[PDB]
Structure 1
Amino acid sequence: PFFDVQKKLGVDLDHWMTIQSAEQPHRIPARCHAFEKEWIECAHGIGSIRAEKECKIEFEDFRECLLRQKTMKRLNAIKRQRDKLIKEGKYTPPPHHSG
């Protein structure tokens, strides 16, 4: 079983190693701070089932902040398209440093 002496004694000795956005020793954020704050406020007073079926949009926004999967997919598609059209030869590219 899981017990709750952590809450019972009033010593929150283990809740600070836990998430981001708990106060760092110098007040700096992580890379996805605000996404976490809105996601935690979305799924706080929630029985973890309408958390699964209701906070899905902001959770996907947070996941794609954390890993940046499909944004890299879009950038990689741009890179492959740029490679094949410079292989073609149309507009010897002025996207680098000059016209």
Structure 2
Amino acid sequence: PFLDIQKKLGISLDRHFMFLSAEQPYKNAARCHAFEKEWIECAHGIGGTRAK
């Protein structure tokens, strides 16, 4: 986000449902949960260009 008030305060107003592999009601896994988890685990920490 343009302002990181959520990260500064430590709260998660909307950061916990940003994708399919996020928190789901009654642990009902979405489609391609494993694939999206692998993609995020790969892309984390290296930046957008290196992720692409």
1:27-42 alignment to 2 at 5 Å? 27-42=27-42
Structure 2: 5+ residue runs without aligned partners? none
**Alignment deviations for residues 50-83 of structure 1 (CA, whole Å, 9 cap, x no partner):** 111xxxxxxxxxxxxxxxxxxxxxxxxxxxxxxx
Task: Give the TM-score normalised by structure 2.
Answer: 0.84
Q: Where do 4+ consecutive residues of structure 1 move more than 3 Å? A: none
Q: Higher helix proportion, which one?
A: 1
Tell me if the contact between 2:20 and 2:31 (Cα under 8 Å) persists in the aligned partners.
no
Q: Which residue of 2 aligns with 1:97?
A: none
Q: Pairwise CA RMSD of aligned residues?
A: 1.5
Matched residue count: 52
**1:27-58, Cα deviation, whole Å (9 max, x unpaired):** 01111110001100110011211111xxxxxx
Structure with the larger RCO, 1 or 2 (CA within 8 Å, 6+ apart): 2
**Which runs of 5 or more residues in structure 1 are unaligned?**
53-99
User: Whose Rg is larger?
Assistant: 1
Q: Partner amino acid for 1:11?
A: I
Indicate conservation of the 8 Å contact 2:17/2:23, yes or no.
no
User: Matches of 2:27 and 2:47 in 1, distance apart?
Assistant: 32
